[model samples]
Target: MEYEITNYSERHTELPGHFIGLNTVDKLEESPLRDFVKSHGGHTVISKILIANNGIAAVKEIRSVRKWAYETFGDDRTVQFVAMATPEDLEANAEYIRMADQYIEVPGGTNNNNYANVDLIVDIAERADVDAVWAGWGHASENPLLPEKLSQSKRKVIFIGPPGNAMRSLGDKISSTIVAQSAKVPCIPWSGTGVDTVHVDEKTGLVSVDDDIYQKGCCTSPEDGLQKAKRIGFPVMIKASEGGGGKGIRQVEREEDFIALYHQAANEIPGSPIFIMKLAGRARHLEVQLLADQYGTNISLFGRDCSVQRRHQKIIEEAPVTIAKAETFHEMEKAAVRLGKLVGYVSAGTVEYLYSHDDGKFYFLELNPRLQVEHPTTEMVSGVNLPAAQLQIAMGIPMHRISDIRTLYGMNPHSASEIDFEFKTQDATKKQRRPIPKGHCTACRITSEDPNDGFKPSGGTLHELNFRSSSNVWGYFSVGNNGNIHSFSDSQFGHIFAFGENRQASRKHMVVALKELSIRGTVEYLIKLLETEDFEDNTITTGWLDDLI
Candidate 1:
């Protein structure tokens, strides 16, 4: 097999020290995975790689595969990105088509609607002779059925993510809650009893119920549900158990609104009931990174503050969670690792928490069982290539031998500042210690929505845009049309990261980075908020931006 050095940028600091251009199958033959393959009596090279349903984030998400191949498979294993594109993507993203060793395209009006074509995507992989398939984040990323189907394929392919069971356990609202309790992770109090949606068969008139449908917080009647809400207290969340990614969830501040909201939520998820839970007013969104291996070695990385969001969608995130009290942050990390280990999680995952400003306590939110969109922020501050490590873990690599986590911070399990363990790396000649990096990093999402107009999404050409690349920047993306800018995506065009010696410095640099950015299709308000005196003096909460807007 042969390869091309399509990417010429300087080697990323987080990659292996021996990183080089993956230009030949011979070089790839000397990879760690190749060693494992040969040990298992396999004699094939992983030449054609297929990436599914990823748009601009394709390169960012699959960069791990390229890095892993560089370390374990070699440059001969080229990653070909698959796009279910509209005409606009075809026009703007033509570079991918030309640069890829192979380009597989299908007809889909938008990236958001491509999840329904999993069968078509699998067919594309089968026809292309793809050995492994990497599904990017969103519906496809969380869908368990796709992986199950892929596993049963006659051609046989691997899913590069957490195993199928972990996906279901963490992705389901009630199941995740149960797993959290088993892990001793604290969650908001709700009905302790397991409840399900009622079901009956039409053909034989057999009555049954679905346990997968967790309707514990749902009431059999309006009075019953409202009563539960009163016990849970006012300002409750009316959510559907099957809802995810901020969908099918609504917040009700008073008892008068609970019944209608409950009905609305129940209607959203047919065959499922509405659930109610306490809402943490003015909460801060914090989450910790977890990496685990099949050998039961689970470790918690640093935390991130993703409080800056609109409509429950995070618009900005900063690593190290400088806003959290030292005790609170460490507790979050401990809980996250405990949960990961409890479930025998065998890849990358996240444990989300909602920190109430009034009580200053953290409650377990839900676990996202995949590599997150904002993971690059963690990479910038921690010098950890999470996706690369996830691949190694999936291949049964041990924690101490993994390359992405070369340097570690706050090792002690009980304390955030504690040093746990430092294992020797692949280069075991004269042993050395890897120093931990100190600093704050921030990521601001770029989107094509108008904040002044109720955040309405606009679909037009990006007349002008600029994304700068420098020592402080990571995952920068920008594009424009005509004399200004154009955008057809509903929202979330890209993200920009800024690094600094400290939190204030990082935020200050982020302000400069945002000011330097120019766009026509959308307005970015994150920098304006970061530049505020109140937010600078006192960090903002999740609803602060929402209220300000």
Candidate 2:
């Protein structure tokens, strides 16, 4: 039986198990550079973005960006990658180094060229003559300061990802809550916020850090924070207001244990404020992926279930959230849209919610203003080319009518049994663009960590790694033929993606795919967890892995 893997874009150059979209590069009516591309016979030459790190994660992501640019725009575009590598990172990420069209090096080995250093990136971007900088997730993606700096450049360099103001508003737990509240969205009991959620005007990219968007309920003193925690009932979560990747966040279940944990979390990062909120004991990690143009078009791609986590980090992820009631997902979608519009948000963003099984309600957690690791799950289920979409929007193309060569697969009215994406134009000039994704896909993030050993980071040379190509698999990861483990900094080795009609079918496909997955270094223990009853039954939650030992 043949299964379908759709690319909702106008063109594509197929890879082994996956097919990425060539949508943005294709001519569309709404594109501002229509005359330039059309007159040039379709090639709007563009430059590049910041990769932010020298880790394996950076290598995977940078290559993904390059693949999109190379496959989509090809010779028409100049997609150079900014690589800032250390001695440790250089050997492991040699794949990206080789793949980059041009390597612009920065000082490595310290915070010299790290995400902390924003001026250097702005200087590089200003000089590159690029249309925009795709802040490929991680350090710069999470850092609002970098985006702000780029937005302020005299050269008019566009930060091709999330807006700095939006990042601060949604990314910071405090400001996000304020914006959610303003949008009338429900959130966990937390702290105060004087900062505006939508500080930047989306069209011109005018921005700053202020309390313009009220999306949070922030707390200042320990006394009041604990008091609120008690009133909401113990088992609370204390997290730093500004940061990403679950850093400086702590969960407290007992009152006696709350003080130490709170202080530990609060003092963990100096200057970054701490906020406390009630924890949903059996909550499912559900989030909606949204794309908005500068012109008020906030389209929610769909929902994803990321409950299967270890230490606040998601391991395996799937979409259409099979466990949640359809009605619940609707509420989540609506809430996300309302918040997006309320903050005047533009570009791609994620509205994450924690659906409480205990109360049958979903509460707002935070907004990940940048592209996430779990994006492939949504792309497989929704038929949206998130990265290209960001690129298109950044180039001043409206979601509706970019450069007019016609053919897109978007939402048709409402929910249906299957996706119907066809380019049915009577005009012969308009080619049939069919990139509609079918079936359910799940991604298992392969890390150099052992589940049995408390998920501790493992490192060594990957000598004989193998995962043969198959129709049912769509891989988003890459590994070099011969590379050394970049010790301690990053643990991600790669990812395995499996697709089928539904969750069960996909899991079955994934299991078989895993059987063939053989790596010389660090043998992953995910197969054992996948075979467990909790994963099989699809009843896993955020707290599932906490006590799974």
Candidate 3:
């Protein structure tokens, strides 16, 4: 039971000091999940794991994972796998269940009876048990229960992908109040409420307002949004004040056109209905990965170059994204921590800023209150097991080297300031000694974009593409493909390409991958957007993906 490269325990290492034992999650000795939980001191495998289609196809993957795990750990009794879905899902994939159950524990739900030590489950907010919930797998507004769930625990929360739920979902006030009531969270700091472009006394102690009202200024219908826009003036970005999943967005260029566009956008029901937020002029999309804890804390973990997007949906992302000033990241992190404490928010969360790269000023757009999609880039660059960290922090373990956070502004051992700076300072103790961008990376998105015809949601058979690295490819194979990832599957719905050097290199790999998708004939959307000029230019926003939608 040996891998040509290394053993599961070989690369996985326990956290340093008290971080020990606290770092790894225990699953059965044979559970494949142990690999992610425990890595030693060597090159470990990384797979592009996507969780979209629930447990249907995931069963196929469970079998492969079980085989891999059982072979490595040989049935470690103390370990646990915390099955994310229901027993019905377990029953659906019986073959997978037979192989995996031997090594893993697939509990019924987040509050599984078998695994009492089960920390968190990646699930919808309604199902999540907030108090027992250290961290649930979601971002802001992802689940209807998020505000309330987040309100319940001061533990670490991990977001699977994107700022869809938090910033995109609840704006600030409603999002804040939920967290405030549950986690004792607070409101997003506003120099001014910007109501009718005029600053007003924000509600406090005396009252509570909804996210739509606080962040969005008003949580009303399209007519209401139009009235607000008209009162303030037209050519604004009108957006829904409810849940966020790339819906309720309208970019009105002129006041005259506002009325017609308003109803069109208003009629649609996505996640929850709402209106379009005003699009920033010459807007340049910017995002940073964030981390927080109950100890009056917040930190910008990593920066994402999410400039490449369409209609606000992020299509391309990179770690340590370049910011205008050397201190931009520092400012963002400082604001994040400050706002987190202000809102009484604990656990893990992300605060996104709409940056006016031109003026070097970023508006506090919203807070995600969850992990992000581009998180792997941060994990890769920093060489930290973010998912593992989220669980540990959720359980109130406090970060292993949480103190390193203070040095976030310092230069990396390579002397790069762009990283959270904490990783750079802990260089000597980190798993990898590479200067910058140390690991192989994979970014997957579930968008309906088409690459062949001007990147229209090129709906057709996806071309198969694999990285030159064999181990990396195999790890990804068992996991499903891009759009709405179904756990089980050898083939990707679209394609996965090994990235290197510059954006074009990734594109070259993408081109080859698309060719293969064409040759083989698979049902996948061609990724025309990623390889396009405008998106590559870095002028992206939440509304960037309007074309695809």
Candidate 4:
């Protein structure tokens, strides 16, 4: 028996070791320069951001930020963006940074050379009456601004936009310590995960204790994570009860992958809260996003999808998918809504589950503590700006009518399964940012590779190619042209039908659309990977991405 394993690239070389428990997912098409300057760490309303950077994207976002400031607040005169003024950047271009509505000038720090200083950001935040400060993941990674630093809701520091794994770990403690001292704002909920729920009490809205989960966590150690699967028997799953995303998750029938994954997750979050979940042999990654208030009741059950992915990180995704029946899907989504409401969770949050295709029973997985990277793809098809909506919710807002979301539209025709089978990833190279029609999402990457071997993500420079879709080789629904479909994604004699009529035809479109995409380099390295049996078979593990070229 063999399986497909995942592999990352040399891009990770510059990444920190702490990236272990850390889960990093980026939208393929994010204006890196813009996101770097104007990222929102927590959920919220989108307003104009002030920034300092001559990079084209940053300049564009800065203009939007300034315009937004005027549009939202009737005052463009107010300072919004800040300039990155570290001494090291003296020789670098500062045209855009200097043009910001607001600006900051601070010197180097402990790890100042590689990243812009946070102290400069905080200093600017202090000097100006800004709502929040923006810092990229790498900056935060180098210098973590814990809850103690925030000290209050006003100045409560945020981690820009990152995963929620540590929010439960380092964040909970940071919050308690921060508020215990005296800060206007000591903590903030990140956007990519459920900031409100990550480390909070289900009922009281207090920071949760770091030692455990629900006081009923069955798996106390690596041994426990594995034991739950044993008790559940073969065809079980082991996971990081304390974490989310596709990271730290694995399923196995026998002990090899099971024990390996269990111990790995155990050693990963050591002394941190974790649990073992029952992994039914067959399941779908059914998930739902919803909004809950301080009172802890769902206002509406949002979009859902169980599309393409390997090693947990979702590749292709879509929303408004009607899996099963509308009534059944609602029942499924309602569980997440109910669970969230029960816990007083708020902002943009996602609940995941393993829906057993066998008995139609879905077991609950852990809640994502922040925004999911797949969010935009959902927004692409659903027409709802979830991140913006999250900010409103955080501001003590509410949805007026559940009817607005009653049976939210799903672009079934744009579903990933159908498109990927028909199209290749190289077709859509001409569009502005490669917009998929009707907001059908697609993404691809030009990762380094063992070129002579196959086009595997080999070690090399990944200069941040933009992605509106996700992962590499994105295709969806039936939109693609014929002949582009690949057999690897499906099993022998496998056939995945579209849920509705639209999907049926869209599948064809995806097949063609994929071929329309253009590749920048030869796929020799990727082709070489095909020579390996595990690459073809679904027998690989999460750590498979790190294996030899």
Candidate 5:
């Protein structure tokens, strides 16, 4: 089947050597990262990679690394991808399945038994003799056990992510918050002493604090929570210590509602510890994309403003954070690097923050120890292949050695630093050295959900899917025509990205592309949302979409 391609005159320019899509691989220069793989172990290369994921995440990673390997090694070295498909995926004829070099069928009755099954993934990696395992954004991406088990395997299969210790430390909200504090990254005023005395149950992996180890911000009961909320001031957020994906969070505006909200928040995630923080009202959600290496080099590619969200879930994301002042954005970059360095973070990770437009202060949120859904926005503006970079870092390539990475740092070509510098000096250098983004990029998620029905997931067999793929606007869907959207599959089925010379042009291109796009099995409000005055003016807050709905 032939796919329609559109060419536009105003194509967005990228860095000197960067290009998008699968066919442009030949234009790429020989990668130092790939060279490192070939030289080590006497010509042993990562010829086979197992993708322990499904849908768009799996498809994106496979396409990225597959192209890089082919370009770097030519026809001599073949880099193959092994995809893990569930029964649902096989029945639906998912795109990733077709794109993979080979596939292995895994039990798919449910997510836990299939994609999220760590043991099964490791076994597949070992049995397949794959050189590495790439766990894309979701599923086992943030799970430390996947990497730990892979490391423990007889073959020591490479896991293309951070070390297990770094993931584990930053995966927990409380522990990550403590690390953020130690890194001098500002955090929300929350109730948590320091986690100086905490116990972890091996059986359930549940953490518990000592009763006698309470501190100023620690709350032992609802009354204590109320007291702490009062001390922190009104309009505070009661959050779960192990919460994520916009769950286990409650906002209390008055003293009378504190205890009730606290109970509800705690009950939402049973056995999970609850903490309170002074909520930043009318805040914009910003996050920095970090790339770190084993040699202690860390750098922030740039920032993304995901303020346009629904129920605390991001709907629209754009890179270079045009909303905040340049200085504020720089601070966020520095703070993100500090947090990554504090946790010894490696590979692609995101440091999220909540920026209050009113007070002009940004507070550290949580660190996602994996690549994010909106990383493409950063890729478009920064001219970096994040998935390829992740694999490179996993292979122990230092950031300074990667040519594209050094471009972002404004370092002189052919110059390499051997001495390890302190974080302070690095921050100062980055402040004056990092190059400004040349363009603006925006990404909108296209999901199999009904916006009119409280944004509930909608499932059906996709009969038709079409998007006007162009030079400046392009995207991919998880499933194609005749592909089924099962109830168990993720709600998000596709993503559309647009790039232009400026923010307005990028947003306008997104609006036009979304309007021209067509899908048979889903409802989308992206066009309406992007055409709104609030969105165009960049005045939308994190909760603005919820309120609009």
Candidate 6:
């Protein structure tokens, strides 16, 4: 596949525009800037950070960016990474634990008491004296409570993502849909549009909703859901208001299945408010990556088409969204920014949407409120170190001060003063325009699951595991030789990414990389899907994989 990939090794070589201390530290002794540097409160300097997740894949990515930031902006101080480990991790001497500058063992073998324990994580942050906490993806990444607790703590540790209020507002499907509509973003017809109060019965699986808040579109029970489904028309999707990762969702093809599916969804995520929406047929899953700053600046770094999914979980993702027309992509980007600004979103977040191939229209899905798993695709095409950018933004860095953001806007990467002047004086309401993206990037998630056994996770000791890593195609495995995949661990243990000038070339490179790979523990079906004609022709939808299986 004669693929050509962009060299992003030097992307963060220069200091960010907000690194005032580092920029002025080397000035002459008699220089007037010395006083400014001496009295600086060091708010922009993140001396220590806590990586609040356990997955080695995410941990490695976050640490890599921190290393780059230190090399680029740390005049004399280095940023330290504090990682969390469980008893199992300590016993196995996991690679993630070994990579941390300091690892703290949280008391619990399960994720609930360790990584997912908000109280324990907060306590460790206070005790560790870390300046900020980076919840990479899973675990407290989307939980609003973690950020709230961190900020309310005595030390007031910063959360390296969106604010708690923004997260809470957009974390749920019902509230996020309402927010999207208020921002004038197109949304799928849903029953929660006018919902006010929601109450669910633990024993009966009945959902009682009151319309007093908005005065309409409330469902009190399964029978009411059938009526709303009929009103919205047949083939509606019964979804849990707070559902994620493909759970608490079901599609009703006819009126007969509506009540059963509604009850099932209500019981799946018990106590979670349930909502219904008009299901789009043959829809492609598209999402826009957004970055917002403390200074009211929100920008889109383009989008990704993650239509190749199995049971609503993404397997392959590509950047620049070639499946949709350029105009449609632009509209999605603008709508994403609008939704982000509506909630005063800060830090890295993704606004997801469903684009129907049948109607050629896109509707709001939900905002992720944290860094997504497929962020590398956008990073490769946008030339931005997203995790590093998150830390900088968390430390109060403005959008104009980031080198990658400046480059995306066609400004000088090193001209901090000029960029700051333009950003401060520019029209705040005007939407920032991003330059057209070049090339194509693809990311394929490699999981240790048996395709023949209904995709059951095959967790065991791996006798052998090997893969390629280079400038164009790169990734990491959660385990190595004789590595153990505990039953409690996630099935997705590795990912491989490739970049090229176009979709065909990128896919070819990915296939070549996968063909040369070897694994002894379990089986993967990603290569089989990639080699199919439907994938190459871009004719697949979100339901294609499930239907194929």
Top-lDDT structure, candidate number: 5
List runs of model 5 lying over 4 Å from the truth. 1-45, 75-77, 193-216, 240-250, 259-273, 410-433, 448-470, 480-492, 518-524
TM-score of 5: 0.79
lDDT of 1 at 97: 39
TM-scores of the candidates in the order shown? 0.74, 0.72, 0.53, 0.50, 0.79, 0.78
Clashes of each: 19, 36, 69, 85, 0, 0
Sorted on lDDT, best first, the list reads 5, 6, 1, 2, 3, 4
Q: Per-residue lDDT tens digits of candidate 5, residues 312-381?
A: 6776888778777888778778778876766667788988788887778888888888887688888878
Model 6 segments more than 4 A misplaced: 1-44, 74-77, 192-211, 221-225, 239-250, 256-275, 417-433, 449-471, 480-487, 490-492, 518-524
lDDT of 4 by residue, 288-320 (tens): 766553223353334555523445544333344
| Error of model 5, residue 219, in angstroms | 0.7
Candidate order by TM-score, decreasing, is 5, 6, 1, 2, 3, 4
Among these predicted structures, which one has the highest TM-score?
A: 5
Clashing residue pairs, backbone N/CA/C < 3 A, model 6: none
Stretches of candidate 3 off by over 4 Å are 1-78, 84-233, 238-252, 256-277, 310-312, 400-442, 446-466, 469-549
What C-alpha RMSD separates each model from the true structure? Answer: 9.7, 9.3, 11.4, 17.0, 9.8, 9.1
Superposition TM-score, candidate 1 onto the true structure: 0.74
Cα deviation of 410, candidate 2, in Å: 5.2
Q: Write down the worst ten-residue block by lDDT for model 6.
A: 1-10
